[PDB]
Amino acid sequence: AKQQRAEATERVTAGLREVLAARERRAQLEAEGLANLKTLLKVVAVPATVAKTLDQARSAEEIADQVEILVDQTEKARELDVQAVAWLEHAQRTFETHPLSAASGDGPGLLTRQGARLQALFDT
Amino acid sequence: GPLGSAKQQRAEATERVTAGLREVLAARERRAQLEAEGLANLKTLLKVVAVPATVAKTLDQARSAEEIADQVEILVDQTEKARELDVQAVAWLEHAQRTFETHPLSAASGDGPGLLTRQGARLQALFDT
Amino acid sequence: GPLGSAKQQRAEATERVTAGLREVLAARERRAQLEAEGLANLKTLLKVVAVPATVAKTLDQARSAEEIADQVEILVDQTEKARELDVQAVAWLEHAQRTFETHPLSAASGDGPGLLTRQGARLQALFDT
Amino acid sequence: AKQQRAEATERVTAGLREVLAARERRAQLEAEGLANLKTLLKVVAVPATVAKTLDQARSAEEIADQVEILVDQTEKARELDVQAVAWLEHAQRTFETHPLSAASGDGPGLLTRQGARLQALFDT
Fold first, then answer.
1. Cα distances (angstroms) measured from residue C108 to each of A59, B106, C93, C113, D124
2. How far apart are CA B48 and CA B41, in angstroms?
3. Burial of D68 (0-12, 13-18, 19+ CB in 10 A)
4. How far is it, in rounded angstroms, from Cα D70 to Cα D49?
5. Closest CA to A110 of A122, A92, A86, A88
């Protein structure tokens, strides 16, 4: 009867030893995995935004969060773009007719020199 | 009298000259004030459509339509540079998604979906347009 | 910017010119205003001694020292003409007194003194000076 | 007794007749005297003031009144003269020093041309 109680106290201690050991090993490997994830992600050029923060990321989760941030920034850039173009075609039209800027006998409109690159923005 | 009416003819001559300058000067001061009014209204007209914060913080202070035109050239450049960053950001995000689907630290395992699974929605949005 | 700072150099040039006229005009307007102040004080100075009614009613309205000078020439002439009337008036009054002393309608009779007897006082006054 | 009463009623009527007659005669002569007084007065030139009124005078008394008036006017003229000279020497002095009128490098004072006749007035 006593034999089974001694054997049990030991199966627990060995169990802890095995659990602690398996954890320390999984940790070290996951670290390697995180290091290599970062390497893999860098194969294609990394936006400056996240690059300087990507390396400091302490888990894959932090990298994913950093991705979300970039996606958010990228959405907001596109709607500024939507405003910016809306205002620029408005600003162009305004400049074409206004006496302080319009194409007179005294030379072209103030925005004629920029007429080229403006039409680029509008179509695309 | 002899003295007094002669003196009066000199005064009228002095005034006709002073009046002459006054007239020229006033034409200038008026052309100025009207151009100023023109600039004020130019700004009002431009603001009818919402002004990008970039341009707004400097637009009201503009001392001529030329300065406003320069402020436009700037916005155009910023917007071009934003648009080529958009290309970089999407190329990398397309790569990151691909990377995440397959990597053991992030892949959809038996333990729940991939880490970027919840963002697949917003991602495919960016990709098509 | 390229457009805006060039425009600024033209504005400063326009203003330097406008400022130039403004400066010339102001020098004139100031020389005028000071001469005006001079005239006002000329009048004040002249009134320190009582001004003959002749000259007074016109002195304040005077548009220059010249008009005041003319108004003086006048007073001098009036005063000369008053002084030669004084000679006529006294010659005749001397004659009238002499006439009255002897004429039966006026002479000191037994009925009381001559008619100009009561005025002999004021008469001899006029005569000596 | 009755003789003296009749004679008395008549001495009164004749008395009135004589009184009325002596008065009408004294009147006519005094008139002649007034006419000739006027003539005598005119031997020496008559001031314009009184001349136009001297002829209309209806008695010697009115002529004397007209004399008084002339004497009054003549006194007042002399004291205006006293003022006028007082102010003119003051006005001269003022003009000599004041910048709007003074003898400059640009020609003499405004009252220099009148300097001559002014000194006439001051001395006499």
1. 152, 157, 18, 4, 37
2. 11
3. middle
4. 7
5. A92
Name which of C82, C21, C22 is nearest C52 in CA terms.
C82
Q: What is the DSSP string of C23-44?
A: HHHHHHHHHHHHHHHHHHHHHH
CA distance A120 to A115: 9
Instruction: Supply B26's token pair.
Output: 């006033």
CB hemisphere CA count around C23 (13 angstroms) = 6
User: Which of C42, C80, C88 is facing D47, going by the closest CB pair?
Assistant: C88
Q: How far apart are the first and last CA of chain B?
A: 95
How many domains does chain B contain in total? Answer: 1
- Of A54, A60, A77, A46, the closest CA to residue B116 belongs to A60
Residue of B47, B66, B68 to mutate, interface with A, max A Cβ within 10 Å? B68
C63: which chain B residues are within 8 Å (Cβ-Cβ)?
Answer: 4, 8, 11
Q: Which chains touch C (3 or more CB pairs under 8 A)?
A: B, D
Question: Which of B75, B79, B84 has the alpha carbon at shortest distance from A47?
Answer: B84
Q: Closest by alpha carbon to D49, among D77, D21, D27, D84?
A: D77
Resolution, in Å, please? Answer: 2.8
Token pair belonging to D79: 């004291």
| B-contacting chains (≥3 CB pairs under 8 Å) | A, C
Q: In the 3-class helix/strand/coil scheme, how is chain B assigned residue by residue?
A: CHHHHHHHHHHHHHHHHHHHHHHHHHHHHHHHHHHHHHHHHHHHHHCCCCCCHHHHHHHCCCCCHHHHHHHHHHHHHHHHHHHHHHHHHHHHHHHHHHHHHHCCCCCCECCECCCCCCCHHHHHHHHHC
Facing C115 at nearest CB: one of D61, D91, D111 = D61
Distance of alpha carbon C107 from alpha carbon C101, whole angstroms: 5
Closest to D83 (Cα-Cα) out of B2, C53, B91, B85:
C53
Domain containing residue D38: 1-124
Sole residue written with tokens 């009144």: D65
